[PDB]
Each structure stands twice: as structure tokens, then as C-alpha cells.
């Protein structure tokens, strides 16, 4: 399905993968040794599974009128959170960036 590179301050950190059945999974690249993507996901584990869209990545999406602005710019359905993340992933709050594979 759909996968994306997740970078921290320009250095490639891991891969966020859309899995079947609505699950998601984030996997750290073994080469990565920088700051964690988030404080809830330190480098001591490499694989994180999620039964929904992981809160951290959902927290990067716009809100309110800004979400309405995104939704009338792009041909993307509301509640396609992963698709919206790829669209804005070049520049979000913090040091994390998202780019599609």
C-alpha cells in the first residue's frame, strides 16, 4: 500500500507504513541514531504498531479553517489522514518531515 519516509531535521529516520485492516506501523532505520521522532517513540524500540493513525502523526495535521483550506486546495477526502500528511509533510510543526515512497 502507501508508505512514507519519516525524517528528523533532514536525516532519514524511519518508515511509516499503511498496513491492511486499518493498522499502521512505524519502523526505525537501524542506521538512525539521532533524536527520536517523538518522545513517545524512543530508539530503544525499532517497530511501533498502531491500531489507528498514530496520534503523533495525526497531531501534525491542520485544524479548523486551516483544514478547510487544505481540503479545498487538494483533491483528497476528509478523514484520509495519511493522504493529508503526505500533502503537507514537507513542512510541519517540529523537526519531522514526511515524504511518500
Amino acid at each position: 500500500m502507501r508508505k512514507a519516509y519519516v525524517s528528523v531535521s533532514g536525516i532519514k529516520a524511519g518508515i511509516l507504513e499503511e498496513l491492511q485492516g486499518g493498522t499502521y506501523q512505524f519502523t526505525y532505520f537501524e542506521d538512525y541514531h539521532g533524536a527520536p521522532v517523538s518522545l513517545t517513540m524512543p530508539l530503544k524500540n525499532k517497530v511501533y504498531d498502531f491500531d489507528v493513525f498514530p496520534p503523533f502523526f495525526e497531531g501534525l495535521l491542520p485544524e479548523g479553517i486551516m483544514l478547510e483550506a487544505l481540503l479545498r486546495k487538494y483533491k483528497i477526502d476528509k478523514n484520509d489522514y495519511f493522504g493529508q500528511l503526505i500533502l503537507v509533510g514537507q513542512d510541519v510543526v517540529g523537526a519531522v518531515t514526511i515524504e511518500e515512497i
Binding site: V8, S9, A35, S38, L39, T40, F53, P55, F56, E58, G59, L61, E63, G64, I65, M66, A69, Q90, D91, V93, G94, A95, V96
Partner: protein, 272 residues
């Protein structure tokens, strides 16, 4: 939107979601703002068409926070193209040379999302701080001071996404202030005093809630520390009154602001 500074450098309930938040760059030569789609260093907040005078409200409120000693980034007002006022704030997750700092809001840190950013509590906020902050005891003092400020100035919109932890020079702490304003006077039929319950309460909060349950039993602050901070707020009320009367709020909006501030000061026995 896109000009240069002035005198200044669904059954849910949210309020900030009726106002735009625009990215912008500071023009190096011209010293004016340029809205950009991406890669901005400032945030611009123009007038909302639903709630009135939000930029002027946010600008004075962030200045009041700076006067009591909260960490407040550079902010101010600019005239939009339609000759109205637009608020700006310098992002603290961008630090020149096009570097970034890690910044995470408490909804991300506690597993909540946008739809559930009100389904939490200040006890849960404290727990996030105790988990991740480098010096939780120092951050607890800041939280206490932030929560008292938001009560006094009628900010009833401090949901989970309005708290953030910043990672700066390997130190994790509560970020500088952002999105602070008097949302009570901006609305009509205001429903709550606190966005997240404290001791299970979102309205009719009392002195013992903040100064006993919160300050002592949940934050572990010594009595002499509490007394000093309370004294700080006492000494700043005259300065706050002056600043509000000198702000860019309309006279009617200034009066709503002062009357709310006095009502909240009186409930905490500031004038007794």
C-alpha cells in the same frame, strides 16, 4: 496579512478554529511579512469573521503574560491589506540557518487527537510533564503560573494542543507561550472557565482549587513558593490595567477585558 509591524515589534466547542494561521517569512530588506505556503518562520493570524478583535486580543494577552514573567516569543501586530490588524508570532521551532527544533503538543504526547483534545485533565497534563521534562519541578512552577494567568485573563481554550514540550539544547521543557487570548470576551454564552477540568471542575473554580489542591497536592510546591507567585500576580494588576487601556482593543472590548479580569481577581481574593 502581508505587511509590516506597527507599535508592536459536531457537538464540540472550540474557538481558535474560526481564525486562520498563516505561514510567513520576514522580508530581509523591506522588513515586512510575506505569506508563504511553506517554509515560513512566522505565523500570522488575521481577523476572524466569526469572533471579533482576536488579533488585538491575542497581542495584548501575550504581552500580559510577558509582564508576569512567562516565556513569550516575539509577537506583535501588522496592518493587513484591508487596513485591519493582524497578529504575528515568531515560531520557536525555527531558529535561523533553517534549522528546526523538536516540538510536540500534549495531545501527541498523551495519545489523544484533534477531536479529543478536550478529553483530558490538568492532572493528566502534570503527568506528561513529570514523564518527559528535564526539570519537572521547574516546569511545575511554570504550569502553576500559566494556569493562574489563563484563569485571570479568561483563556478557557487551553486544550491539549495548546501545551507543548520543546527540545532545545538537549533540554526538554514547556515551550514558550502561544495561542493565549481572552476567549471568554471574544464569545457570547461562554460555557466554561477551564478547557481541561481541574479537580473535576471546569466552572466555579475557587482559591482552594488553585492554591491548595493544585499547588500543594498535585504540584508539590512549597508554601513560600506559592506565596511569592501569588504576590507577583498582586503586584502586576495595576500594570495589567494600564496595558489593557493602552492596547489596540476597542473601548467596548477593553471594558469586557477589565471587567472579566476584576471578577477573576476578586474570586481569588486579590482585593480582600
Amino acid at each position: 496579512m502581508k505587511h509590516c509591524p506597527i507599535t508592536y515589534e459536531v457537538g464540540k466547542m472550540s474557538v481558535q478554529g474560526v481564525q486562520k494561521k498563516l505561514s510567513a517569512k520576514l522580508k530581509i530588506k523591506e522588513g515586512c511579512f510575506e505569506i508563504v505556503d511553506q517554509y515560513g518562520q512566522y505565523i500570522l493570524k488575521p481577523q476572524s469573521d466569526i469572533y471579533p478583535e482576536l488579533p488585538e486580543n491575542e497581542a495584548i494577552t501575550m504581552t500580559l503574560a510577558k509582564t508576569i514573567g512567562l516565556e513569550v516569543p516575539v509577537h506583535g501586530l501588522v496592518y493587513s491589506k484591508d487596513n485591519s490588524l493582524t497578529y504575528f508570532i515568531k515560531r520557536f521551532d525555527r531558529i535561523g540557518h533553517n534549522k528546526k527544533l523538536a516540538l510536540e503538543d500534549f495531545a501527541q504526547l498523551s495519545g489523544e487527537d484533534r477531536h479529543t483534545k478536550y478529553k483530558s485533565s490538568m492532572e493528566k497534563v502534570i503527568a506528561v510533564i513529570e514523564q518527559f521534562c528535564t526539570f519537572p519541578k521547574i516546569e511545575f512552577v511554570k504550569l502553576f503560573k500559566l494556569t493562574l494567568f489563563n484563569f485571570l485573563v479568561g483563556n478557557e481554550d487551553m486544550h491539549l494542543k495548546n501545551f507543548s514540550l520543546i527540545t532545545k539544547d538537549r533540554k526538554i521543557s514547556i515551550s514558550p507561550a502561544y495561542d493565549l487570548l481572552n476567549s471568554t470576551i471574544a464569545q457570547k454564552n461562554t460555557k466554561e472557565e477551564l478547557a481541561l477540568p481541574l479537580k473535576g471542575k471546569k466552572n466555579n473554580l475557587t482559591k482552594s482549587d488553585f492554591l491548595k489542591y493544585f499547588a500543594i497536592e498535585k504540584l508539590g510546591l512549597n508554601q513560600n513558593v506559592i506565596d511569592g507567585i501569588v504576590q507577583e500576580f498582586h503586584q502586576v494588576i495595576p500594570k495589567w490595567q494600564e496595558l489593557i487601556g493602552f492596547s489596540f482593543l476597542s473601548q467596548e472590548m477593553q471594558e469586557k477585558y477589565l471587567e472579566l479580569l476584576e471578577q477573576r481577581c476578586k474570586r481569588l481574593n486579590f482585593f480582600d
